[PDB]
Amino acid sequence: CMEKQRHDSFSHSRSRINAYKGLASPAYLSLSSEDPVLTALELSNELAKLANIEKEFKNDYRKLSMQCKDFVVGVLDLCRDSEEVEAILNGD
Amino acid sequence: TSLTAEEERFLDAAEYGNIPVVRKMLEESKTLNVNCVDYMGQNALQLAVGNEHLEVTELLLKKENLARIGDALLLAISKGYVRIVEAILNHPGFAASKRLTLSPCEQELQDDDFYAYDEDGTRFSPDITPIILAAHCQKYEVVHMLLMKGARIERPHDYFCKCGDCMEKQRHDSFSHSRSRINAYKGLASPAYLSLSSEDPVLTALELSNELAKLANIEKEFKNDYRKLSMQCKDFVVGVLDLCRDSEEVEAILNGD
Numbered sequence: 001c002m003e004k005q006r007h008d009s010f011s012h013s014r015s016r017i018n019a020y021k022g023l024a025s026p027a028y029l030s031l032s033s034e035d036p037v038l039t040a041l042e043l044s045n046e047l048a049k050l051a052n053i054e055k056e057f058k059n060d061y062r063k064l065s066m067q068c069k070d071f072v073v074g075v076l077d078l079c080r081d082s083e084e085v086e087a088i089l090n091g092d
Numbered sequence: 093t094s095l096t097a098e099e100e101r102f103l104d105a106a107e108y109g110n111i112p113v114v115r116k117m118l119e120e121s122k123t124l125n126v127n128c129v130d131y132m133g134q135n136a137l138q139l140a141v142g143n144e145h146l147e148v149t150e151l152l153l154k155k156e157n158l159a160r161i162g163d164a165l166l167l168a169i170s171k172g173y174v175r176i177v178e179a180i181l182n183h184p185g186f187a188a189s190k191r192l193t194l195s196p197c198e199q200e201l202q203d204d205d206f207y208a209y210d211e212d213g214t215r216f217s218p219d220i221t222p223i224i225l226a227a228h229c230q231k232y233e234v235v236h237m238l239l240m241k242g243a244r245i246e247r248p249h250d251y252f253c254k255c256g257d258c259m260e261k262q263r264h265d266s267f268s269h270s271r272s273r274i275n276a277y278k279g280l281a282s283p284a285y286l287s288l289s290s291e292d293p294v295l296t297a298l299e300l301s302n303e304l305a306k307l308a309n310i311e312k313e314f315k316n317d318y319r320k321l322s323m324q325c326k327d328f329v330v331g332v333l334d335l336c337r338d339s340e341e342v343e344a345i346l347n348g349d
């Protein structure tokens with residue numbers, strides 16, 4: 001990370017933004033791992049913290065956290081049974 | 093894939109609509125059961141219904157023992173395949189049973205995979221009947237067809253009802269109960285269902301709008317849904333009024349018989 005930071009820091013930030021944009025994809029969120037709603041919530045929190053820290057690409061990280069929030073609310077929304085609602089509102 | 097070569101050929105012929113190939117495969121073949129489905133795929137009937145093939149769907153429906161016929165009907169109703177809907181309704185399963193009128197969840201013991209979908213659930217909510225789905229889509233032709241069969245969207249009971257059926261539904265899965273009530277009212281408040289449901293549809297729309305507004309006051313949880321449905325009824329009333337071009341039509345709309 002330090003070697004990447006020494007030269008071309010702008011490309012370093014761009015690469016981090018692109019990697020998080022890949023992680024915060026609804027497709028990647030759903031197909032990446034089991035319990036994708038918890039993963040989406042944790043990733044959204046991490047993106048919000050990074051938006052606080054960076055203070056330069058704040059709109060990008062806010063957009064990505066919005067994508068994660070949209071994924072969480074969309075996964076919740078499609079529930080049509082109470083058991084699905086209970087499973088989403090609390091895991092194993 | 094657990095499927096064999098001949099059933100793979102039949103499935104691709106049905107999905108791509110190769111009517112001669114499907115007819116050759118399904119006629120006088122000991123093997124190649126018609127209701128062969130992939131592990132996580134679609135039935136031959138579902139393939140021939142999702143892509144409009146009235147001839148292929150009719151050939152599939154010719155076989156007496158076919159699975160997920162109700163799912164094929166729901167797929168055709170969700171779309172505009174009026175001829176496919178008519179063909180599926182002409183099947184002896186719908187004609188000589190209470191299957192069409194009642195919802196997939198509460199029609200019968202539902203042991204047979206009539207309305208069933210790929211593996212676990214149904215294509216739509218288990219509470220959505222064919223007529224409710226048609227009203228949802230505002231399919232005027234399909235709504236009229238289902239009405240001619242006697243399939244009418246039954247009005248849900250009062251919010252404070254205390255009968256045995258409503259209480260039993262309330263005891264477990266109350267969220268699904270509320271979802272079913274919302275879907276039934278969405279079917280009732282369809283402009284298509286409002287117009288084609290009964291005589292004097294403007295009065296029916298006004299009364300239904302008032303009932304929906306009262307329910308929005310009472311529920312305080314799905315207030316936006318009931319406000320949207322009452323807005324749909326108000327739009328229907330104003331639209332029916334608007335199309336008047338003669339004073340007699342205006343007088344008839346502004347006061348009934």
Ligand SMILES: [Zn+2]
Nearest residue numbers: 001002003004
């Ligand atoms: Zn590092």
Ligand SMILES: [Zn+2]
Nearest residue numbers: 249253255258
């Ligand atoms: Zn009741």
